[PDB]
From Swiss-Prot, chain A:
This is Mediator of RNA polymerase II transcription subunit 10. The keyword Membrane does not apply. Keywords: Activator, Nucleus, Transcription, Transcription regulation. Present with 1472 molecules/cell in log phase SD medium. Its main location: nucleus. Belongs to the Mediator complex subunit 10 family. GO terms for biological process: negative regulation of transcription by RNA polymerase II; positive regulation of transcription by RNA polymerase II; positive regulation of transcription elongation by RNA polymerase II; positive regulation of transcription initiation by RNA polymerase II; RNA polymerase II preinitiation complex assembly. Component of the Mediator complex, a coactivator involved in the regulated transcription of nearly all RNA polymerase II-dependent genes. Mediator functions as a bridge to convey information from gene-specific regulatory proteins to the basal RNA polymerase II transcription machinery. The Mediator complex, having a compact conformation in its free form, is recruited to promoters by direct interactions with regulatory proteins and serves for the assembly of a functional preinitiation complex with RNA polymerase II and the general transcription factors.
Curated annotation (Swiss-Prot), chain B:
Disulfide bonds: none annotated. Belongs to the Mediator complex subunit 14 family. Component of the Mediator complex, a coactivator involved in the regulated transcription of nearly all RNA polymerase II-dependent genes. Mediator functions as a bridge to convey information from gene-specific regulatory proteins to the basal RNA polymerase II transcription machinery. The Mediator complex, having a compact conformation in its free form, is recruited to promoters by direct interactions with regulatory proteins and serves for the assembly of a functional preinitiation complex with RNA polymerase II and the general transcription factors. The gene is RGR1. Present with 319 molecules/cell in log phase SD medium. It is found in: Nucleus. This is Mediator of RNA polymerase II transcription subunit 14. The chain holds residues 89 to 194 of 1082 of the full protein. Component of the Mediator complex, which is composed of at least 21 subunits that form three structurally distinct submodules. The Mediator head module contains MED6, MED8, MED11, SRB4/MED17, SRB5/MED18, ROX3/MED19, SRB2/MED20 and SRB6/MED22, the middle module contains MED1, MED4, NUT1/MED5, MED7, CSE2/MED9, NUT2/MED10, SRB7/MED21 and SOH1/MED31, and the tail module contains MED2, PGD1/MED3, RGR1/MED14, GAL11/MED15 and SIN4/MED16. The head and the middle modules interact directly with RNA polymerase II, whereas the elongated tail module interacts with gene-specific regulatory proteins.
Curated annotation (Swiss-Prot), chain C:
The gene is ROX3. The chain holds residues 15 to 148 of 220 of the full protein. Belongs to the Mediator complex subunit 19 family. Component of the Mediator complex, which is composed of at least 21 subunits that form three structurally distinct submodules. The Mediator head module contains MED6, MED8, MED11, SRB4/MED17, SRB5/MED18, ROX3/MED19, SRB2/MED20 and SRB6/MED22, the middle module contains MED1, MED4, NUT1/MED5, MED7, CSE2/MED9, NUT2/MED10, SRB7/MED21 and SOH1/MED31, and the tail module contains MED2, PGD1/MED3, RGR1/MED14, GAL11/MED15 and SIN4/MED16. The head and the middle modules interact directly with RNA polymerase II, whereas the elongated tail module interacts with gene-specific regulatory proteins. This is Mediator of RNA polymerase II transcription subunit 19. It is found in: Nucleus. It comes from Saccharomyces cerevisiae (strain ATCC 204508 / S288c). Present with 6116 molecules/cell in log phase SD medium. Component of the Mediator complex, a coactivator involved in the regulated transcription of nearly all RNA polymerase II-dependent genes. Mediator functions as a bridge to convey information from gene-specific regulatory proteins to the basal RNA polymerase II transcription machinery. The Mediator complex, having a compact conformation in its free form, is recruited to promoters by direct interactions with regulatory proteins and serves for the assembly of a functional preinitiation complex with RNA polymerase II and the general transcription factors.
Length: 146, 101, 81
């Protein structure tokens, strides 16, 4: 029990660190774009642009190196999820409808199981009734099924 | 199952290749083109790369939230089309065996 | 004829009759993204895509071998011109 909790905590910490690093990368890219749009052409601005580019490259390299560690806890995303997330929204209706379909399938399964159970119970009862000589195997049939 | 590390490595390799191609194209592009157009193209490329990295960020956040719901979801789906396949197999068996009737 | 006492069929595991969600303690995430709360009221507004997961970050998302030093120097020379 303690090992699973420790592994979960380590995975959460690693994912939080990755999230923070990627957020910093995104902020640096936003700053880079802002500087490019409002570039004055001064040598100091050029040096700042070079430093920002170097920092972005170093951050990307560090993220690639850390995320590729075989010992990292990071090591499924279906293509349908990628297709659904391309619609500019908050990702809930896909899960809602597909879980609704899942629940409908489960309810169908339970209802058909109950129906089949009553079917074979009634059939066993009547086979015992009109055919007492076959009563003994029928119960064994239940033992063979249940 | 696709490893997240492999996806991240592929995305980084694609980003590096795109950046190298853009730098090369800027290198052999004639100087007659205004620097404003090149700056705009570089900004657009940076925005696209940032969007890809933000998609990776969203995937990382989802994995941080992560599989329990995914595992239940996949198991219930497997049960569903297994039942459907059993129904179709029953129908096919009756269609085939009607000849022997 | 086919009644074989040696042939015994076991129950399918897990049993679909039982609550398969709670078999492995898998109710936390289901409750987190449940359609409705315990009182039946809507918890959160529902939508389709990942856009609202990036709204907290700055920006306007209206529509949704290699020498780095040499490239940086080339960009610097181009910008200074």
């Amino acid at each position: 029990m303690n090992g699973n909790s420790t592994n979960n905590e380590q995975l959460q910490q690693e994912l939080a660190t990755t999230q923070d690093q990627v957020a910093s990368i995104i902020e640096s890219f936003v700053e880079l774009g802002v500087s490019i749009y409002d570039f004055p052409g001064t040598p100091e601005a050029t040096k700042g642009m070079i430093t920002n580019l170097q920092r972005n490259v170093d951050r990307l390299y560090k993220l690639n190196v850390r995320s590729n560690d075989p010992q990292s806890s990071l090591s499924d995303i279906p293509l349908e999820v990628v297709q659904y997330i391309e619609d500019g929204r908050n990702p809930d209706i896909y899960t809602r409808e597909f879980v609704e379909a899942i629940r409908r399938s489960n309810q169908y399964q339970r209802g058909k199981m109950h129906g089949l159970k009553q079917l074979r119970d009634s059939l066993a009862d009547k086979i015992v009734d009109e055919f007492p000589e076959l009563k003994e195997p029928v119960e064994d049939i239940i033992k063979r099924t249940s | 199952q696709v490893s997240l590390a492999l996806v991240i490595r592929n995305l980084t390799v694609f980003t590096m290749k795109e950046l190298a191609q853009y730098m090369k194209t800027n290198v052999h592009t004639q100087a007659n083109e205004p620097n404003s157009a090149k700056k705009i193209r570089f900004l657009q490329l940076i925005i696209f790369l940032r969007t890809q990295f933000l998609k990776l960020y969203v995937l990382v956040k989802w994995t941080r939230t992560i599989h329990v719901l995914i595992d239940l979801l996949n198991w219930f789906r497997t049960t569903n089309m297994n039942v459907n396949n059993c129904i179709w197999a029953l129908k096919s068996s009756l269609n085939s065996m009607t000849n022997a009737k | 004829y086919y009644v074989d006492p040696e042939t015994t069929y076991t129950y399918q595991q897990p049993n679909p009759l039982q609550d398969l969600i709670s078999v492995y303690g898998l109710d936390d995430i289901s409750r987190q993204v449940a359609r409705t709360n315990l009182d039946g009221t809507k918890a959160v507004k529902l939508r389709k895509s990942y856009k609202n997961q990036i709204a907290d970050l700055s920006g306007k998302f209206s529509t949704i071998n290699f020498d780095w030093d040499l490239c940086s120097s080339v960009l610097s020379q181009f910008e200074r011109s």
